[PDB]
Each structure stands twice: as structure tokens, then as C-alpha cells.
């Protein structure tokens, strides 16, 4: 009720999630067991956001060793990809070709398998019962259903459990999907290999090639989950912060960051308007030198990063971009010196 | 994008970021196991597409097979020099996810606000390309009329930006909160 907890606790974008995660480690689950047991939930809950068709990374620390890692089980594009298959943005954003290989169960089985505390099955249970038992749809659903009213609408399949009398769920009315409990039923009884290269398998690709998608069993069967045991880093006064370095955006966060605190930001910068605005100008402002040095990240597999990122994560490079940060405006986006290609 | 942070009894965390990119994402379900398909390819820089107005493509990011796209997700920890996990954040809503996750630790770390209120406040965004600060609805007015006067071009997020769910160590124990912006609500013991 004042979400402050001595022992242990698990923020989700959802109650009954946070709750699932919570039992979790209650009976004896690892931190890594609550976070797999509640987004499991999650993709129930707000289908909308992520489920076990997409991707996920985890940034995981151990108290007792002292060390991060992350595990990467981002989707990959097919084999079958190429550059130029899209010629607008609808071809990219719609139908089977848009798919790109899953990574979500294989990161959850990597995750468990280095820190599970609790059996795979376990980590299911609560959610299969939901799926099959139903829920009231929740505000963040309610309103991307309404979003979206036109082509849920327009699509049966969706509308099979998306509607209600043809017409999008709104918030409070239940939302049950049979179909996603008999798939977790699988997953938890056969493990990861009923998605990859098992029991699930061929009813993937028919449905991703029915819509019009590349994707293909050798996809499936390839997909690997990644640990990384040296996550990007930076130091702030007395702590340390992890996060994932390319493909995400650990290096712009880091930038961020690294330009702000030599202005040594405390509640003083806010106290009054006018350190107030002039903070926040600030802040813009180290958005847009961060934003500039974005468009030179991709997959470090593919592109050369490493010195890009040397120096987005350099206090003496955000030094110098610090000091091109006037006090009195903003400037035009050429200030930035975006890049797209490497000197 | 969901977006979810987990502290455990011996002090272990875990921030984990997860994603089928648009809502629904390829709106492609499968009548027989009900998974709703991602529409990740669309994270992929094409060197055809109008991205936006005078948005170029980029090729570091032009899809490849077997490459992963670019993504703004950052699921973090903070560790103080002690070895105790000081905050696990992270954030869910597309490209405002970066510049989220940065003002909730902001917030937190130098502002000196509990963790209830850094998720809760108000948040702005600008990426560069498109070149305008969005700002939140309840957004101190007096922020507003200090970048006007720098002159940036604001303009008012018709929804929210992004999603924060954080937990931050105090004396009294593990803090949590979820963002009021979803309806989400943490839980604990
Ligand atoms: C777009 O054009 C390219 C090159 O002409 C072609 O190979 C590709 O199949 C096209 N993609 C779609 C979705 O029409
Ligand atoms: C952390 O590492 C220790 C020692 O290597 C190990 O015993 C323990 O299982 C790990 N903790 C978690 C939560 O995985
Ligand atoms: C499972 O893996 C083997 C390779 O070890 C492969 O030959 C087979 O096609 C796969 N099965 C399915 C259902 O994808
Ligand atoms: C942070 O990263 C740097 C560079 O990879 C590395 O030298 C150092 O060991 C890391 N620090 C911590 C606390 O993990
Ligand atoms: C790294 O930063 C230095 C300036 O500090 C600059 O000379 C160099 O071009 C940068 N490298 C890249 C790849 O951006
Ligand atoms: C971007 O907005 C800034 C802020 O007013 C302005 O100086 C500039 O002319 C705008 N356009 C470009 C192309 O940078
Ligand atoms: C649903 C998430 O907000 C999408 C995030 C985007 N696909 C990315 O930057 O990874
Ligand atoms: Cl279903
Ligand atoms: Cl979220
Ligand atoms: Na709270």
C-alpha cells in the first residue's frame, strides 16, 4: 500500500504480474525465477507490449559475487532477409514479412538455467491459470485496443479474442486466451525445445509464411540467446551503473548521463523557476548530443562499435559536449553533428 | 515494450525489458497457439522508406540476416561502491524509453525525489530527429516557458511518455513503484 518492503519486491506494469513475481520468491524462487514468472503474466495481461512472440534482454547482478551480466535474446532478422525487401513503411510494419525470429523463450530458458532456483513448470503455472480463467482488461490494454479498434476489428483472428460482440474489449469487460494457455501448458512441460525445435515448431512458420512471412524452421532450430558477462558500465559519484551496451542503448543513456553530471545536479536545481527551466534546458540539450552519436549504433556482430562507443561512454568526450551546451538556447540540428558513417 | 524490475531478499536484481514492437505488433496472430507475432524488422533502417521528413536512413542499422536491430530499451542496475544493488529501473514506449530511464534516475539520484514521485513527474523528450520537445500534459508550465524562451519548439504529448516501473533502496527498506501512466502496481514482502 506504500510499496516500500523490507525483504523483496517485484514492479510490474500490472498488479496480479507484480504478485506473480512475488509468490515466486516467496516460495524460493530467485530473482531471475519472479522476473520469468511475471513476464510470462505479462504478455497475458498487456498482450499489446510483449509475449513469448517477441524479444527481451535482462540485466541481472548477484549480491554475493558482485557481478552483472546480461543476457541478449533479442529477435534476429530471418535468414531469408535482405536489405532493400521493404519499399514503404506498412510493408514493415504489418503482416508476416515484419516478423522477425522470436528470442523471448530462449532468453527466459538461458536465464533459468544459470539462476533458477524454482522448476520450469513452476514459473507457468500461475500464468496458464489465468489465460484459461480470464481477466478484467486493464487501463494500459483498454486504451491500445482502442488504439487500434479499426484493424483489430477488421481482422477475425484477432477479434476472436481481442472482441466482444465484434466490437474491442473496453477496460473492466474479461479477456480470456485459450489458445496461449494451451501453448504455456506446452512450453512448460516440453521446455524451450517445443518453440525452437519441437512440438510448436511447424505451426510457427505455417502461420508466418500464411501471412506472408520468411521465416523458417532452420530460424527457429539457429536462434541462440546470448550472455554477455561484461555489461556496459559508468561510474556515478560512489555507484556503478549496468546496462546493455549496442544493439540497445546502454551508450546513449551513458552519454546522457555523462554530460549531466558535471553540471553536480542536486535539489538546489530545482528549487527555484529559474534554476528550475535552465536545468531542463540542460537536460534537452544533453538529449540532443546523445540522440546525434545514436545513428552510428547497430549490432556489434555486423558493425564496428567499439570506438563509437569508447566514446559515448568517455567522461572527457561528454566534457567536451558539456561545453557546447549554451546557457541562454538551443540550436539548429546540424550543431549535434549527427553522423551516419564513421571519419 | 514492458518493462519490469525485481529486487530478491538476498539482494540480487534483475531488469528485464521485453518487446513485440508496435502495439500488437505484425497484428499477425496464430489461430492454433494464439502468439501474437513481433513486427521487429520495422527497428531495421531501410534505405527505401521516408522514415520522417528529412530523417535519412542509417546504415549501421540496415538489416542483414541473422543481425539484430537497434533498440532504445535499457533495463539497468545501479550498484553502490559497497556491493548493494542502489536502483533498478527501466522503461517501456518506444523511442522516449532512453531519455525516460535517464530522467527517473535523474529524478531519483540529484533531484532527491523518492521513487513514487520520479516515476510519477512529469517527463519531456526530444531526440533530435524530428527536431521538437514533446512535453507532458502536466508538465510545471514554468518549464515550458523556460524553453520557449531558449527557443525550442514544445508541443504536448496527446497520451504520456513512456512507461517507468523502478525500485530504489532506502533506509526503510526496498521502495518499488509502477507507473500510474499503465496501471501497474508493485508487490512485495
Ligand atoms: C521491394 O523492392 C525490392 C527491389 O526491387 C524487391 O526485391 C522486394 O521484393 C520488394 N519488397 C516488397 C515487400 O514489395
Ligand atoms: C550468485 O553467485 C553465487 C556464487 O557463485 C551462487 O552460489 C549463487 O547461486 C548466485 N546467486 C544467484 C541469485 O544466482
Ligand atoms: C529439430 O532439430 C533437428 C536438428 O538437430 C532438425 O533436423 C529438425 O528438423 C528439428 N525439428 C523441428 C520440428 O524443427
Ligand atoms: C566497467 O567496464 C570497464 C570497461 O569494460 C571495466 O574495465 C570495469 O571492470 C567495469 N567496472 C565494473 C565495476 O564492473
Ligand atoms: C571519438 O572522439 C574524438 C574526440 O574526442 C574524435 O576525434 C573521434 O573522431 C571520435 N571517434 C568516433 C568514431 O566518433
Ligand atoms: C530546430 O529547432 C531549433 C529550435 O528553435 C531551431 O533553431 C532550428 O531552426 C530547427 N530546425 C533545424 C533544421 O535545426
Ligand atoms: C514496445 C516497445 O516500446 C518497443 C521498443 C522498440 N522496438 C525498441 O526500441 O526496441
Ligand atoms: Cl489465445
Ligand atoms: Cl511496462
Ligand atoms: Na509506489
Known sequence: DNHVYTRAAVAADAKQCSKIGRDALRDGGSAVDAAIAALLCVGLMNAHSMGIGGGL?????????????????????????????????EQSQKGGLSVAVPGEIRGYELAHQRHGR???????????????????????????????????????????????????????????????????ETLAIEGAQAFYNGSLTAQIVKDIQAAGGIVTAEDLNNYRAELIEHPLNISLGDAVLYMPSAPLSGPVLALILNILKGYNFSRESVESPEQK????????????????????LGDPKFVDVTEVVRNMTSEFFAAQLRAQISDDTTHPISYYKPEFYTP | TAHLSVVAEDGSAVSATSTINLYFGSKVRSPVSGILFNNEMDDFSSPSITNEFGVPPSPANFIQPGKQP?????????????????????????????????????????????????????????????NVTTVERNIDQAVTAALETRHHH?????????????????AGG???????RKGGEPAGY
Open chain 2, 154 to 170: 514544445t508541443q504536448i504529448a496527446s497520451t504520456f511518455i513512456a512507461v517507468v516501473q523502478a525500485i530504489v533502496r532506502t
Open chain 1, 277 to 296: 527551466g535552465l536545468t531542463y534546458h540542460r537536460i534537452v540539450e544533453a538529449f540532443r548530443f546523445a540522440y546525434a552519436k545514436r545513428t552510428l
Open chain 2, 70 to 130: 537497434l533498440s532504445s530499451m535499457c533495463p539497468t542496475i545501479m550498484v553502490g561502491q559497497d556491493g548493494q544493488v542502489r536502483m533498478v529501473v527501466g522503461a517501456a514506449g518506444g523511442t522516449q524509453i532512453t531519455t525516460a530511464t535517464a530522467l527517473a534516475i535523474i529524478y531519483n539520484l540529484w533531484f532527491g525525489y523518492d521513487v513514487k514521485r520520479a516515476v510519477e513527474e512529469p517527463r519531456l523528450h526530444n531526440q533530435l530527429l524530428p
Open chain 1, 57 to 89: 534482454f535482462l540485466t541481472i547482478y548477484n549480491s554475493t559475487t558482485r557481478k552483472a551480466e546480461v543476457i541478449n535474446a533479442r529477435e534476429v532478422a530471418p535468414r531469408l532477409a535482405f536489405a532493400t525487401m521493404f519499399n514503404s513503411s
Open chain 1, 118 to 184: 524454482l522448476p520450469w513448470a513452476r514459473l507457468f503455472q500461475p500464468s496458464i491459470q489465468l489465460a484459461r480463467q480470464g481477466f478484467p482488461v486493464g487501463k494500459g490494454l483498454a486504451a491500445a485496443l482502442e488504439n487500434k479498434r479499426t484493424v483489430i476489428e477488421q481482422q477475425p483472428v484477432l477479434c476472436e479474442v481481442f472482441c466482444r460482440d465484434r466490437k474491442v474489449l473496453r477496460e473492466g469487460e474479461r479477456l480470456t486466451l485459450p489458445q496461449l494457455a494451451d501453448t504455456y
Open chain 2, 174 to 180: 526496498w521502495a518499488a513503484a509502477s507507473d500510474s
